[PDB]
Amino acid sequence: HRYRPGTVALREIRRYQKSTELLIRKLPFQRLVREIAQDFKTDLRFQSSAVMALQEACEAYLVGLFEDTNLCAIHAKRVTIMPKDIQLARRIRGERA
Amino acid sequence: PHRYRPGTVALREIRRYQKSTELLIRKLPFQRLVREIAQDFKTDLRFQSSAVMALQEACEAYLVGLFEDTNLCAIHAKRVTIMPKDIQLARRIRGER
Amino acid sequence: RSRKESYSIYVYKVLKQVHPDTGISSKAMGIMNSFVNDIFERIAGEASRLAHYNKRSTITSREIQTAVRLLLPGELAKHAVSEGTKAVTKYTSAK
Amino acid sequence: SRKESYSIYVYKVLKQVHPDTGISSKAMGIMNSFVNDIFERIAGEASRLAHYNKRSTITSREIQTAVRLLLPGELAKHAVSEGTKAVTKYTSA
Amino acid sequence: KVLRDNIQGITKPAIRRLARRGGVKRISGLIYEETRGVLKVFLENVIRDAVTYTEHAKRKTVTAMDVVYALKRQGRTLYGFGG
Amino acid sequence: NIQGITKPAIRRLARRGGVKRISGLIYEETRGVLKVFLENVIRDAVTYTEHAKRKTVTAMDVVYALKRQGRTLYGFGG
Amino acid sequence: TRSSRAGLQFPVGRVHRLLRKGNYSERVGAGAPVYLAAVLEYLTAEILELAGNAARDNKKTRIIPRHLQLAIRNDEELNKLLGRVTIAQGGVLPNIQAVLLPK
DNA sequence: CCTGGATAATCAGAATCCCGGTGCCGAGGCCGCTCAATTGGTCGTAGACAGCTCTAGCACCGCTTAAACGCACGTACGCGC
DNA sequence: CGCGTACGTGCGTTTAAGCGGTGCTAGAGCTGTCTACGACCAATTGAGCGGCCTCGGCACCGGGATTCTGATTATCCAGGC
Numbered sequence: 176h177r178y179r180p181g182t183v184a185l186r187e188i189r190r191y192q193k194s195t196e197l198l199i200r201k202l203p204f205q206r207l208v209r210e211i212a213q214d215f216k217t218d219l220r221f222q223s224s225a226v227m228a229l230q231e232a233c234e235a236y237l238v239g240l241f242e243d244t245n246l247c248a249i250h251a252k253r254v255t256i257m258p259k260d261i262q263l264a265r266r267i268r269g270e271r272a
Numbered sequence: 273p274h275r276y277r278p279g280t281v282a283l284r285e286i287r288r289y290q291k292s293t294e295l296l297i298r299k300l301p302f303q304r305l306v307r308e309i310a311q312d313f314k315t316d317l318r319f320q321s322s323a324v325m326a327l328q329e330a331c332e333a334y335l336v337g338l339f340e341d342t343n344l345c346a347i348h349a350k351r352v353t354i355m356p357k358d359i360q361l362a363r364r365i366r367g368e369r
Numbered sequence: 370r371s372r373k374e375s376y377s378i379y380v381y382k383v384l385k386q387v388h389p390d391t392g393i394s395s396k397a398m399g400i401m402n403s404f405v406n407d408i409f410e411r412i413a414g415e416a417s418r419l420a421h422y423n424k425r426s427t428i429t430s431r432e433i434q435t436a437v438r439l440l441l442p443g444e445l446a447k448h449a450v451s452e453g454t455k456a457v458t459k460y461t462s463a464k
Numbered sequence: 465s466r467k468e469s470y471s472i473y474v475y476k477v478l479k480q481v482h483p484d485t486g487i488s489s490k491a492m493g494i495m496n497s498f499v500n501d502i503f504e505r506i507a508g509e510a511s512r513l514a515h516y517n518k519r520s521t522i523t524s525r526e527i528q529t530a531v532r533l534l535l536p537g538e539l540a541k542h543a544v545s546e547g548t549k550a551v552t553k554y555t556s557a
Numbered sequence: 558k559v560l561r562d563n564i565q566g567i568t569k570p571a572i573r574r575l576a577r578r579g580g581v582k583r584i585s586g587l588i589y590e591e592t593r594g595v596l597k598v599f600l601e602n603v604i605r606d607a608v609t610y611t612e613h614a615k616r617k618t619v620t621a622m623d624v625v626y627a628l629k630r631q632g633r634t635l636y637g638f639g640g
Numbered sequence: 641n642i643q644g645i646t647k648p649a650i651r652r653l654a655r656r657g658g659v660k661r662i663s664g665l666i667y668e669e670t671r672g673v674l675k676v677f678l679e680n681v682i683r684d685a686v687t688y689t690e691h692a693k694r695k696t697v698t699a700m701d702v703v704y705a706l707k708r709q710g711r712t713l714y715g716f717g718g
Numbered sequence: 719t720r721s722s723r724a725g726l727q728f729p730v731g732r733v734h735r736l737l738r739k740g741n742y743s744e745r746v747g748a749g750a751p752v753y754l755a756a757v758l759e760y761l762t763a764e765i766l767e768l769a770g771n772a773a774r775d776n777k778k779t780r781i782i783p784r785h786l787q788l789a790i791r792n793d794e795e796l797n798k799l800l801g802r803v804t805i806a807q808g809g810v811l812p813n814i815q816a817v818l819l820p821k
Numbered sequence: 822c823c824t825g826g827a828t829a830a831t832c833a834g835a836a837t838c839c840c841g842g843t844g845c846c847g848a849g850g851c852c853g854c855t856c857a858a859t860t861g862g863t864c865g866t867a868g869a870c871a872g873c874t875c876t877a878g879c880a881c882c883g884c885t886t887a888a889a890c891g892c893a894c895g896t897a898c899g900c901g902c
Numbered sequence: 903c904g905c906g907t908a909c910g911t912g913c914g915t916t917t918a919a920g921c922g923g924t925g926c927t928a929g930a931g932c933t934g935t936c937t938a939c940g941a942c943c944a945a946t947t948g949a950g951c952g953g954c955c956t957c958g959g960c961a962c963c964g965g966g967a968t969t970c971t972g973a974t975t976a977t978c979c980a981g982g983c
Contacts, residue, residue, distance in 0.1 A: 184660050305564055
């Protein structure tokens with residue numbers, strides 16, 4: 176049959192909140208890290224655990240930002256998150272000026 | 273007679289208290305509150321007047337910034353009146369417990 | 370071959386003291402070592418700040434005590450104060 | 465009892481940048497607290513990197529990279545140029 | 558003399574003035590209590606640090622420097638009172 | 641590169657954060673926020689490495705950069 | 719040693735060496751490394767305690783970083799201590815807001 | 822007799838529990854070197870502590886009047902649809 | 903788009919914020935002398951970490967087999983016209 180829009184999302188929430196595996200793949204994020212690092216210094220090498228540390232910290236920061244974004248979206252009488260929620264979360268957080 | 277519409281005196285007070293720099297909380301009730309709170313932590317304590325002034329400056333600045341984030345959250349909640357849930361969401365995004 | 374130091378066997382001994390039939394992974398062991406190092410750096414820097422503020426060049430047990438009472442939350446700080454004072458008195462008794 | 469402060473130096477800098485402009489006592493206290501706060505921040509950053517690089521001294525390079533880490537881009541760049549010209553004209557003279 | 562209910566010394570027009578300085582146009586009636594509690598959440602977070610400084614200096618008088626160092630610890634540093 | 645952070649990857653990151661419904665511009669805003677955060681942390685780590693006189697950015701510089709930014713990470717030699 | 723003299727397991731030697739070499743003060747007292755090792759020992763005892771409890775709750779004999787994340791975020795004071803601390807391979811707590819639940 | 826809602830079944834897929842392999846491993850404990858902890862002993866000065874002095878925090882007391890409470894009225898704002 | 907009303911506004915009343923003239927003493931601050939605990943150096947020693955080897959969890963793949971709702975059609979019953 177057919178499922179309602181939003182139940183597979185809740186199942187994915189219950190699945191990924193119990194797991195610890197990284198949700199961004201290693202090679203495109205590693206290429207993005209290297210592309211950003213070439214903008215600051217040329218001829219750089221990267222340890223693999225450095226890229227793993229960057230991936231873990233960035234994924235945890237984005238998960239916490241999505242938590243605050245969902246809180247802002249719920250407070251804004253919605254269930255769908257929006258870039259205004261991200262902007263308000265980064266404004267109260269002090270990252271965005 | 274004469275009676276202003278609701279919303280003009282609040283804006284005039286916003287402009288007046290944003291133009292000025294003097295402390296909005298009175299000195300003696302705040303000093304009594306500080307002595308009461310510090311009396312609940314350690315009995316027989318004296319207080320420099322400049323210490324209570326520094327406490328008043330820091331508390332007033334923190335409450336003004338909290339009211340700024342509260343007004344921003346109330347605007348994001350499609351309102352113009354601030355609510356205690358705005359204070360609560362601003363303190364949750366700020367990381368205060 | 371460089372001889373890198375760590376807190377592996379020490380945290381292993383404390384784990385065996387609190388849970389005899391429980392092990393620990395190296396991914397958790399690195400987190401525990403970083404936790405011990407972070408708490409060490411925080412309490413030592415807080416003692417350094419207190420010694421610099423109180424115009425004293427000596428970091429005694431009192432400086433670490435007020436560093437723990439500043440950094441740790443109330444029940445945790447109280448239990449750490451009791452543990453620290455107990456170990457300081459037991460070190461003072463022996464020679 | 466002598467209380468050391470950066471009062472006359474900030475007075476000299478202010479008269480260098482604004483000769484018809486004085487400072488108040490509260491603003492002088494704010495400036496003196498700012499100087500000590502920035503000094504403590506840069507010195508703590510240089511001490512942190514000196515502890516990181518296994519080195520028991522703090523030279524001009526550690527203060528330079530502490531300024532480059534702490535201060536934002538244009539401010540850090542201008543402070544880097546000012547620090548390097550001061551180190552060079554201290555070394556020559 | 559005993560000290561009781563000084564938290565209500567922070568009157569509703571004071572919280573109104575703090576909201577006007579913060580840019581708040583309309584204030585609910587349930588704000589003036591709750592913000593006061595947040596002020597307690599401020600003050601019990603600050604002075605409890607500063608007394609911990611005052612207990613280390615073996616003093617019975619809370620100075621401005623202990624308040625400044627308590628604000629230094631909380632990430633809420635202040636200019637104009639030393640440091 | 642920056643589009644290498646795919647829409648299902650940001651979808652999984654939102655599912656871990658507890659987001660039920662995701663807008664279309666959420667992926668691009670998350671890409672921009674991730675780019676800014678990676679720019680800051682990688683800039684601090686590159687400053688650490690160029691002060692350490694090395695051409696290989698280690699995990700120690702990443703750990704110290706995250707400790708600088710108030711986002712201290714446990715598990716990589718802290 | 720000095721760990722056996724103090725009833726502790728953590729080394730007084732390593733802590734007393736790092737307190738001197740860490741550029742913390744001119745002189746470092748003798749009661750300070752015992753106190754710091756005891757505080758570190760109680761803190762790792764509480765963390766390993768709640769980690770072992772979480773490992774027994776998850777039916778595992780070895781402590782994984784998920785158990786450490788459960789031990790940190792489940793306790794209020796341990797989460798308050800490690801508030802700005804990211805644990806690698808730790809994840810988040812299972813938490814779904816009320817409006818996200820279906821009717 | 823018509824009609825609206827509550828429930829009490831209904832099978833039906835989507836998801837979930839369970840077993841089997843090729844797979845590479847990674848905890849955790851012993852062998853053993855080795856350099857940092859231990860220990861004895863000497864130099865020294867930060868600081869403990871009792872003295873002195875001295876600003877400044879606290880208490881009171883009362884003139885003045887700006888500041889706050891509360892009531893009454895009402896319109897425009899929160900929220901319900 | 904509309905409904906109900908909460909908080910904006912002004913004035914009378916009442917309350918205590920502020921002023922700046924006064925006494926006191928408690929505790930911050932300056933000082934002065936002696937010392938024990940802390941650094942420094944040298945020989946000694948043993949706990950610590952490198953190496954490596956065995957084993958206990960380890961894994962997400964895959965196609966039958968369990969199970970848990972969900973859309974699904976229908977069906978019954980009590981209330982109102």
